[PDB]
Design a protein around this ligand. Sequence first.
Ligand SMILES: CC(C)(C)c1cc(NC(=O)Nc2ccc(Cl)c(COc3cccnc3)c2)[nH]n1
Length: 351
Amino acid sequence: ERPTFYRQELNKTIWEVPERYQNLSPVGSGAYGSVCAAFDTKTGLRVAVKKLSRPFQSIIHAKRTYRELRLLKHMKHENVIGLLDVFTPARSLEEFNDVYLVTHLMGADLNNIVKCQKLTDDHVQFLIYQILRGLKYIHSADIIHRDLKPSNLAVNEDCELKILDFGLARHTDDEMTGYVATRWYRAPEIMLNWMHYNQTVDIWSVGCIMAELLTGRTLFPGTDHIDQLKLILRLVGTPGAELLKKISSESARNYIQSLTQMPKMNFANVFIGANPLAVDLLEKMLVLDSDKRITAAQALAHAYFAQYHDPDDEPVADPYDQSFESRDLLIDEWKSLTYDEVISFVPPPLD
Ligand SMILES: CC(C)(C)c1cc(NC(=O)Nc2ccc(Cl)c(COc3cccnc3)c2)[nH]n1
């Protein structure tokens, strides 16, 4: 039944893991946990193991922990990250305090690819294709990523691509401040809090990512929130009256109307030399009104992806029950909910 655990300290943190996992080596940490690379001897895999940092600190924390576990137990798709394993050294609910998550070891992110390599149009096709493929899956489970950027995309030597979230820290006001990649890929409505937002926020990010794969340059490297809004409105144009009504923040609405009105730019004169089909796709992604952005599913059928598109191999997620998001529970209740999910986990099969 239960495997044997051994202990070791790595960077003032104690790790207790099953013997199967060997050669633990620290790779990163933050307020929400620490990660080691390791070798899983039962599967033959290089794996990553995250140890959650006091997962049941507060109500809000415990619920956060439950949420990621549920989330990761559910993601089963080639272009999305999955759970290899999840474990606890705890022998009963009474002593459950620590949670460990196991995933495939990710090496290079997409930020490393565009930085250190020249990409062909065909490269960009395959890379964006896979993001959209994964995103169709994620969205069909009513999950929004909200933080799509190159660094949250893992890419191996064959340009095969997985969406995940490496994030280990709080998403605070300070990290979104200033000249920071954290904010360059954010949909404007979620950056200036215009309104209740939706799936299409992630599509805007793909817009920004695709542009950067084509040029090798950040699309909207704002020096701050407002500077970035100007860079954005310079390209796609200031909003019309139709879009202004949909902006719930009267204060935000009011700021936008103080701007000099500008037309949408010619994208062929921005993305000089790009495939006309890439240009067209960007025009349908980088749309200010989120009601009117192309969806992941719609985007898969666009002629830019003709080499790769296969409507029989672009699967959707099983129904995902997200009713817990509405419930207010106590720490011990989130905790036990989490514990059930730990003990019920069934590992994936390798072929
Ligand atoms: C929207 C999607 C489904 C993409 C999403 C994913 C997440 N969160 C995570 O992916 N979390 C997570 C948890 C544990 C581990 Cl081990 C990892 C991968 O971490 C590494 C670190 C270093 C090298 N390789 C993998 C991710 N939220 N939303």
